[PDB]
Design a protein around this nucleic acid. Sequence first.
RNA 1: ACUGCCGUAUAGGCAG
Length: 189
Amino acid sequence: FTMDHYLDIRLRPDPEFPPAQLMCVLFGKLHQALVAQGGDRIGVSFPDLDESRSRLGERLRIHASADDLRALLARPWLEGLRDHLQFGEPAVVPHPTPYRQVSRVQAKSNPERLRRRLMRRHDLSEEEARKRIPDTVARALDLPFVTLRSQSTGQHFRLFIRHGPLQVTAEEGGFTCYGLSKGGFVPWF
RNA sequence: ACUGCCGUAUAGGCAG
């Protein structure tokens, strides 16, 4: 709809850095750009997604207005990265395409963590908490992910990404500062 | 496979 432009970024193979690491860094710098930019009008997708193998592939697509794309290309978030990437031209998307949400998915991967929260919210003990929240509560996602380092937290975390069911038409909605759906759809091709 | 947040929640959502 309003996001009828896109830019493709393809990773260049490198002897010192495997593709997954270049992708994490690319995605992380995008996040930094999007925070600075502000707004909720820029989306991403991973056109070379390999769902069978939960791999994102070596392509990052930015979905936005033509102007944003030309700005994003000249901006410092890409510093140190440009030599590791190949860029397409900011372009109008093909048509027709299906649309899909590209979303962050989170999992209760750590029962102990849910327990510290529970204790804090019900003044419970560890033994009480463990009785109510067993270790089987743990869920593992079968999804591709990037590994990120937060600046505000200190943590390294995995950010799991799901490319949702193909839809014929898009619905109104925006995107987080990681370019992931908070309702918005992007064209898939 | 981290830390936390919302929620009565172990349901389910969210932040970096």
